[model samples]
Target: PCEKHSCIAVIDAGSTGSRLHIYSYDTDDTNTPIHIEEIWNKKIKPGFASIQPNSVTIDAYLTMLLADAPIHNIPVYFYATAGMRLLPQSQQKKYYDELDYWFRQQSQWQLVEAKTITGNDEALFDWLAVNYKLDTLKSVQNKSVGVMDMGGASVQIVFPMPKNAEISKHNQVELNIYGQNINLYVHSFLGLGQTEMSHQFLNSPSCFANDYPLPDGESGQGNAPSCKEEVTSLMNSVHKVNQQIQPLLALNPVNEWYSIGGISNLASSQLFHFENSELTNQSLLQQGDNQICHQQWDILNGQYPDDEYLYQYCLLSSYYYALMVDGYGINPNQTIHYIPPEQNLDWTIGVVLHRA
Candidate 1:
């Protein structure tokens, strides 16, 4: 129990894993959440979608995730994202059925909502979470702050925009937080995340470092520029990220950019050198070219033994350039801030702030 503060739990059922965050907060005169603090946090691997829907398996997973939480009897939100979105609704129902049963068996936890959130909702939350962290949600500002979340199975981009009759209602969200009105244009490109996008170019030589083994019995001849071009094809010709986002951004400009997800991991790695938890697309691609793409794969692997994600650094760096520069039409020299990966930040905090 939080004593004087209200407590709640949120489970981010991500593609790669499930993260449980418990927060305690006090509300302002406006009844908006204030002084929010995270009290308990835990993440378990093998995504919720990856697990079997059997009763025993589901129980075990839930036990591992919530059995040891310091606080219980709090309302919980179990919102799944892109990974679960990939599954058919019929298949998704099976998981939810077993999940609902597990909650029914428990008394300490109150399951408020357990369902897959649309990418657009996820994008709004992404914007909210980042702005909250940056302390930008409390008041109106002269400059626009944009946020991008590069998840394993999907990527989201959201920024401030006045309501426009021309755009689809699904792409827009209007909210009143901290007594201030905010309107945002949000979009999530499904199957455009690092992991999902990687599958299509796994055999591409330009996406890997020198001498890297490919599953197709070929060797990798990594080149960042070439790799970016290949990824851009997927982002443009196939996904049409440019066609969807560029014009909107051009009309309503963003003065700042913040990113959350695998990019943070790659930027923080020993293989790359970046200061201030940020990197420009130009520097990112250049560093990837020199450090991972052009280097011998064996040498890099031996050098960064602790980095589990070192192998994909080259591709990820190039892909970010492709997505941000070519896909989103962001300037190559533009600085994009990334939340530290260790913080394990996700959109759940936004869920806490926006109860609806």
Candidate 2:
């Protein structure tokens, strides 16, 4: 049979949450799926630290999800992102075994993959999505856009490296997408993302965020600059001595992030001018640096007192500042440009192509 219809289901098992995307194609182009839907999704904090096979499979919700599926014989790909990638070896073994059980229980679905993807893997997917959204994926560009993604446990930067340089095993590779391939420079910094980075903070009767409420019987103040300085040190410690960060500059890449929920406005706040970025309406986060962060503490408890997790932002903002200034070595004041959207977008398209 000539290629006509194909169904691809991908699950992004990230730290804070997981979302399942169902793509069904019935037309000439396989990538151009006729219909897509997010049939099942849910989230929890801190993520699954250790996986026990007999305990829980790919997800406790799997059986429920399969029940709702139109069919199950099709391929189901589960790519664990930063959250799982940062686990210990022993824990990884358990996680893999757990996924194996999902395979045995559901003999119907094609388990294409059930493994963790590196930060560099994320960078490639992100880069692919951005270009496709901007209507540039099908054709080569005057220059490619550099992409950065900050997740709960890690952050990644992916772009082209210099012409002549020593590349590591997975640090750089030729990515072929839409029939176009190029040497990609990518790296992921673990524990730099919002959730894990919080472990670095030192608190007292107070928490990391100043205005943030304590456990009923505690009180203390918070300093934006001080927190900024402290996290700045932590960020600096993660990077090498005077590591070169200008490779992406020549490409003049833009930043992109989904800025809300447990996910911080950190990436967007640090990379873009807050007033003009996604958080446009919120004046509270517009003031750059320590002041904005410090001020946020006061309103945070009042704003979403129910969600203590949102409090992570109060410190994450500081970490983002440190990442941009110290880790990536790009002055936040320097000029930058970003540019676009599709749901089944460049997001999963790249991965789908790879797994196919």
Candidate 3:
């Protein structure tokens, strides 16, 4: 019972796929938030841009979207995430240029640069958004939530507490909690992500010690190295991260950690058990339904509702926190001022949007 003409289209081009989501905003009531409608997802295949290098994959994906535009006829907003940002500088430019050209040639639509958000930013935003959603839906208040977003290339842990709490005014990277004013560390460990882990094990055997047994001989050899030494090395990287972040964790004692993104999706069961037992080194809480396990897919497929709106809210809040920490008044339009090209972190460049 929805009108065809009232649909709004949103696209998210992520590591796994390029998705087109059509949403119908209910205007029957002035105060009601918009609702999602039809969703179409297409996997662009891994390494499409890397393999093709000529935008063939992107062109094909956009072509399908344009073909459907007549039926939808909705205003479309396109966003590209970490995959594009992680491309080599030359390749990234090529991809963007070809993407822009294709959209201009094929459709009367607007393509916005969805800047890559850093692992740290992603984790922080995930926590903020999840908590915000919980408050709105469940009426939960004054509770601190930690977000653990394990992405393709990194893992981010974030904790956000209420304003009256000691940590309220601090940046995502800082915390004043549990009677200790310390920096709540939001770290993005590069070269330790899922993809990076695989690449490191397969491409550089010397990086890992020998005498490590493979998980399954020969068959899984070319994939992630299953050598005990290699796994130990990888885990050591995680442990190093723990060592670096021990101070922050000690200070904050994260009440809950909501795991999100690719790694979590793949290892949710293991993570859940670990969280319940061995990983419960601290008084950490765990809550994210099976939905958390599908975060990467959800992100790639543009399946989540209010994703862009939620992202904008997070960006504004983070920007405000940064400004406040610097003893400056919060600018209402800082997100507008943040240019994609100006973002130094590759991971931070993909999820951010620039104003047209």
**Candidate with the greatest lDDT versus the true structure:** 1
**TM-score, every prediction:** 0.95, 0.74, 0.53
Stretches > 4 Å off in candidate 1: none
Task: Give the Cα-based TM-score of candidate 3 against the true structure.
Answer: 0.53
lDDT of 2 by residue, 264-352 (tens): 23424342344333332122223433343444466655655565445555465555555655566655554333222213343565565
What does candidate 2 score in Cα RMSD to the true structure? 5.3
Per-model clash counts, in order, read: 0, 1, 12
Question: Of models 1 and 2, which has the larger lDDT?
Answer: 1
**What are the runs in model 2 whose C-alpha is more than 4 Å off?**
1-4, 25-51, 55-61, 162-165, 202-221, 239-312, 334-347
Q: How much does candidate 1 score in TM-score?
A: 0.95
Q: Residue-wise lDDT of candidate 3 within 98-176, one digit each (tens)? A: 7767767744565544334455655544443344333421333344455554455554556543233433233345422
Per-residue CA lDDT of candidate 1, range 159-180, in tens?
A: 9999999999999999889999
* Poorest stretch of ten by lDDT in candidate 2: 256-265
